[PDB]
């Protein structure tokens, strides 16, 4: 603050120290899910690593 020098009133405006904050939340669940019948897994899958896991 500023006040006039040699001012008849001698009051001072006390300043405030306010700490702020914000929250960071873990709030999402990203997933990839696959369903294979016994026929699909037995007959239609050949590698399962370059055909299921890599995709």
């Amino acid at each position: 603050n500023r006040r006039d020098l040699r001012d008849p009133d001698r009051t001072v405006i006390a300043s405030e120290l306010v700490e702020h904050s914000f929250g960071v939340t873990l709030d999402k669940h990203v997933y990839a899910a696959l369903k294979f019948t016994d026929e699909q897994r037995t007959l239609d899958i050949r590698d399962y690593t370059k055909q299921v896991l890599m995709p």
Binding site: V30, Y31, A32, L34, K50, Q51, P55
Partner: protein
């Protein structure tokens, strides 16, 4: 007057038929597939793999 028996001379002096220079074969994907005999209709089917979404 005088008669002279002369041949007909044929010469080659490097004059050829101007003809294109070939560049296309070297730039195109040639023979990723070979076993066209042994596939119906001389057709080999290429499989493009799958992609999922999460």
């Amino acid at each position: 007057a005088h008669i002279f028996v002369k041949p007909e001379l044929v010469a080659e002096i490097g004059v050829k038929q101007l003809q294109r220079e070939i560049v296309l074969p070297g730039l195109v994907w040639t023979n990723p597939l070979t076993d066209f005999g042994g596939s119906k209709n001389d057709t080999i089917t290429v499989r493009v793999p799958a992609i999922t979404t999460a």
